[PDB]
Amino acid sequence: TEEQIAEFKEAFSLFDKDGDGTITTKELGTVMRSLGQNPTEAELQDMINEVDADGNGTIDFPEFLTMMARKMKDTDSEEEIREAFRVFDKDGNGYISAAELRHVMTNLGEKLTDEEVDEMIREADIDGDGQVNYEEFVQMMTAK
């Protein structure tokens, strides 16, 4: 994990930008606005609440490492994603429509680029009366 913590120290330096070792709300909003994103204050606050375990209001480097250390291919995260799909499932059979999914992605929540959706649909076998098994997507994007 020495190369891992090397890359994580590198990545943490990009947010730190000085010898503090802590990340402020402003200290993150600047980095994001460099990317042309324009987040809200409360958004950065919510991002930063779910990293720190001290409650002080910034991200220490061990907290950063704790974030990076835990895994997306998780027993619980799989269930969360699977249960998120079911909100949009008619009849709950484990299948959803192509056009319906395209509509949900491009309109609801953080709206996607159309070409991103064009990539998304073709990852799975979409044929067979237009239906698609979403557990396939789950296993895919939980494969890491």
Binding site: E7, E10, A11, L14, F15, V31, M32, L35, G36, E41, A42, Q45, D46, M47, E50, V51, M67, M68, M72, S77, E80, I81, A84, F85, V87, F88, D91, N93, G94, Y95, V104, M105, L108, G109, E110, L112, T113, E115, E116, E119, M120, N133, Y134, E135, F137, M140, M141, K144
Partner: protein, 348 residues
């Protein structure tokens, strides 16, 4: 292939009235077969019952067997049940095991019995056992188990305490009344086993009256016991009632709020965006308009956004409370006063 899902939801997730009429009918058939089995015990009516329980039995086995095969074929409308292995997973769950056992054992007993009294000795239990077939989704059982689990400490507590009081008071009564003879000349409290029996049947407010204390010591102790201990064998009723009620009510009030839908959308979208991050030549990289170190920071932000969405959705799955109000009022007032100061500076 809509026929498949159609019959599925007709059999497994029923709604309407035609579905309900069907399931109610099947319930009546099984109850009726049971009560014939009840009448098989009465010597006055073991004649008719044993005979008519031969025709009905074969009718029901062909019925439920045909029904099970249709059901198992129709299950493929689901996604985790398609495939032979999917079916084999569908038969793995409890209620299907129950149905299979009932039908198969019915076949065994009917084929051995025609060419056999132990048969009917088994039939009665199978008739009793078929009642599990009614709940098609185990909603009752799941509800009970949930509510029991939530209140496990209270129930263990009252069980422990009432147990102790039973043990100690029944020992004291035994000491008091091992000599006491009934009016009929027999000794009720011969042994501590019988005192425990009396204690159980007393503390829980049944009172058959087959064992009674005679001596003033026993009556004193029984009074204090019956007045101060019975209430521990009656807590579970109130606890379980409150739990059932609240459980159901939250489960149906959550049928209304719709922020779950945007939060779910957001969750799925950021999850797949994060997955698109790893592959270097993903198309999604065009959203920002060259990538010296941008890989890292983008992965960091998207990772965080994912866990943020995860928790927001999770918290959206639950009802509201005062904590929400307090926290959001704080946040809003603070952001406000920040902007107030910003403008108060703008005046300069």
């Amino acid at each position: 292939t809509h026929v498949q899902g159609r019959v599925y939801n007709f059999l497994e997730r029923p709604t309407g009235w035609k579905c309900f009429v069907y399931h109610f009918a099947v319930f009546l058939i099984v109850l009726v077969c049971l009560i014939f089995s009840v009448l098989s015990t009465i010597e006055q009516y073991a004649a008719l019952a044993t005979g008519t329980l031969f025709w009905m039995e074969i009718v029901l086995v062909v019925f439920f067997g045909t029904e099970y095969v249709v059901r198992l074929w129709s299950a493929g409308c689901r996604s985790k049940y398609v495939g032979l292995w999917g079916r084999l997973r569908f038969a793995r769950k409890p209620i299907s095991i129950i149905d299979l056992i009932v039908v198969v054992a019915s076949m065994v007993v009917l084929c051995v019995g025609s060419k056999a009294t132990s048969a009917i000795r088994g039939i009665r239990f199978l008739q009793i056992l078929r009642m599990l077939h009614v709940d098609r989704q185990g909603g009752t059982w799941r509800l009970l188990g949930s509510v029991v689990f939530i209140h496990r400490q209270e129930l263990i507590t009252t069980l422990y305490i009432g147990f102790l009081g039973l043990i100690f008071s029944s020992y004291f009564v035994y000491l008091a009344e091992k000599d006491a003879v009934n009016e009929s000349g027999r000794v009720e409290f011969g042994s501590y086993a019988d005192a425990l029996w009396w204690g159980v049947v007393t503390v829980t407010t049944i009172g058959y009256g087959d064992k009674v204390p005679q001596t003033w010591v026993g009556k004193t102790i029984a009074s204090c016991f019956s007045v101060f201990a019975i209430s521990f064998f009656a807590l579970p009723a109130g606890i379980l009632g409150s739990g059932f009620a609240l459980k159901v009510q939250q489960k149906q009030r959550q049928k209304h709020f719709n922020r779950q839908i945007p939060a779910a959308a957001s969750l799925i979208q950021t999850a797949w965006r994060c997955y698109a991050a790893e592959n270097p030549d993903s198309s999604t990289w065009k959203i920002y308009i060259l990538r010296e170190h941008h890989r890292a920071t983008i992965k960091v932000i998207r990772r965080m956004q994912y866990f943020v969405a995860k928790k927001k959705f999770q918290q959206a799955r639950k009802p509201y409370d005062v904590r929400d109000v307090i926290e959001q009022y704080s946040q809003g007032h603070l952001n406000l006063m920040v902007r107030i100061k910003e403008l108060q500076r703008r005046l300069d």
